[PDB]
């Protein structure tokens, strides 16, 4: 797993767990976008 | 109730509802303090 990177492919391979981890990832992208906006409001008060 | 200011005392009279509103009041002063602290932290971070 750790030498070959076959952990993430091990995850990608199964139908159920692909949907689970993909769902968690898209949610992750949107959260990080919101975080970039929030940091922006802090760097410039107005 | 509105002329005598006796609405608040009317609530004070029943014990169960008095314990209820007392719980709500203590939660209030604590909230306003935390709000001031959050505003302060915002002032000294950006």
Swiss-Prot record, chains A, B:
It comes from the Eukaryota. It is found in: Mitochondrion intermembrane space. Constitutes the soluble short form (S-MGM1) generated by cleavage by PCP1, which plays a central role in mitochondrial inner membrane fusion and cristae morphology. The transmembrane long form (L-MGM1) and the S-MGM1 form higher-order helical assemblies that coordinate the fusion of mitochondrial inner membranes. Inner membrane-anchored L-MGM1 molecules initiate membrane remodeling by recruiting soluble S-MGM1 to rapidly polymerize into a flexible cylindrical scaffold encaging the mitochondrial inner membrane. This is Dynamin-like GTPase MGM1, small form. It comes from Chaetomium thermophilum (strain DSM 1495 / CBS 144.50 / IMI 039719) (Thermochaetoides thermophila). The gene is MGM1. The chain holds residues 865 to 910 of 939 of the full protein.
